[PDB]
Amino acid sequence: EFMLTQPHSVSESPEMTVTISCTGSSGSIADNYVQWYQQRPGSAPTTVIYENYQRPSGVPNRFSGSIDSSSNSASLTISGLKTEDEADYYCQSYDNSNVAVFGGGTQLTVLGQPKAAPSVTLFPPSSEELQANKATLVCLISDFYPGAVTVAWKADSSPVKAGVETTTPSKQSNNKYAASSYLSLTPEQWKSHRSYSCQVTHEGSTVEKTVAP
């Protein structure tokens, strides 16, 4: 039983040192070859770590591996972050029963400019579509610096996670990104609940807007 956990994104100032951990909260980690990979949008991922304590020859010498905290929680220590290091990362490990477990998405970015707040805009749930027996919601995101953000929905008395769709962010003219979120609901739930809210998770902040009938 081997499992991992990856944060959404980590960002720091240039020339600093960051740490991204694979979080082996299940099973042993130090008994396998921990691997890290690098992927750009569109192309296939590439190797950035070949051995637990050794880097491959096809990558610049700016990475160091933290295999164990003496109990668990393997990590990766990257020194000398620059603009060319901005890419996606994925943890790679194996279970003792030949079960390969990829950690997940991990985006590293450099804070070359101040982190702008994401703009959020809500709208009524398309009263015409309500007449069409549908109550799908829509949320708008724009003007945020990170390449990807996670979206969450909140109802009047409980959070909403089921039926949530998130669009792939796209770069604007000002080197910023914009995305969108959609929530599928029934007209009875919209008429019963008091209101709903859309919040956008940012690297150090959160912008949230509300909508009510």
Partner 1 sequence: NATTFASVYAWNRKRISNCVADYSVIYNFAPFFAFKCYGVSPTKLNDLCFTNVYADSFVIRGNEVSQIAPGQTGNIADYNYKLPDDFTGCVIAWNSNKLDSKPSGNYNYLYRLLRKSKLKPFERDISTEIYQAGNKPCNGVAGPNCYSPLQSYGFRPTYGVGHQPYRVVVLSFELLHAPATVCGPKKSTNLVKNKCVNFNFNGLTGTGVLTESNKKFLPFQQFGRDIADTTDAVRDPQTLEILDITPCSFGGVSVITPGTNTSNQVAVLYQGVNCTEVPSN
Partner 2 sequence: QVQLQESGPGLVRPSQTLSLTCTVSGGSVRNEYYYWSWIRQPPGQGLEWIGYMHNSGNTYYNPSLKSRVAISVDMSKNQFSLKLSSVTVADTAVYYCARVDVGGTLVSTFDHWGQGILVTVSSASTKGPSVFPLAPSTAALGCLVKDYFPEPVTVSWNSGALVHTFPAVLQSSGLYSLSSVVTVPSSSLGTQTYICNVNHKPSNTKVDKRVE
Alpha carbon distances (Å) from 175 to 9, 58, 140, 178, 201: 18, 29, 18, 10, 19
Q: Which listed option, partner 1, partner 2, none, makes contact with residue 157 (CB within 5 to 8 Å by class)?
A: none
List of residues contacting partner 1 (CB under 8 A): 32, 94-98
Dist CA 202 CA 198 (whole Å): 13
N residues, the chain: 213
Q: How far is the CB of 100 from partner 1 (least distance, A)?
A: 8
* Residue 97 CB partners (closer than 8 Å, separation 6+): none
**Nearer to partner 1 among residue 1 and residue 188 (C-beta):** 1
List of residues contacting partner 2 (CB under 8 A): 6, 32-33, 35, 37, 39, 44-47, 50-51, 56, 90, 92, 94, 98-106, 121, 123-124, 126-129, 132, 134, 136, 138, 140-142, 163, 165-170, 178-180, 182, 184
* Residue 63 CB partners (closer than 8 Å, separation 6+): 36, 48, 49, 55, 76, 77, 78, 79
**Nearer to partner 1 among residue 24 and residue 146 (C-beta):** 24
**Nearer to partner 1 among residue 74 and residue 179 (C-beta):** 74
The closest alpha carbon to 106, from 206, 212, 198, 10, belongs to 10
E strands within the chain?
A: 9-12, 17-21, 35-39, 46-47, 63-66, 75-79, 87-94, 100-110, 119-122, 137-144, 151-154, 159-160, 164-166, 170-171, 177-183, 196-202, 205-211
Q: How far is the CB of 3 from partner 2 (least distance, A)?
A: 12
Q: How far is the CB of 14 from partner 2 (least distance, A)?
A: 26
Q: Which listed option, partner 1, partner 2, none, makes contact with residue 167 (CB within 5 to 8 Å by class)?
A: partner 2
Q: How far is the CB of 16 from partner 2 (least distance, A)?
A: 25
Q: How far is the CB of 94 from partner 1 (least distance, A)?
A: 5
Q: Which listed option, partner 1, partner 2, none, makes contact with residue 96 (CB within 5 to 8 Å by class)?
A: partner 1
**Nearer to partner 2 among residue 14 and residue 163 (C-beta):** 163
**Nearer to partner 1 among residue 94 and residue 190 (C-beta):** 94
The closest alpha carbon to 94, from 85, 86, 103, belongs to 103
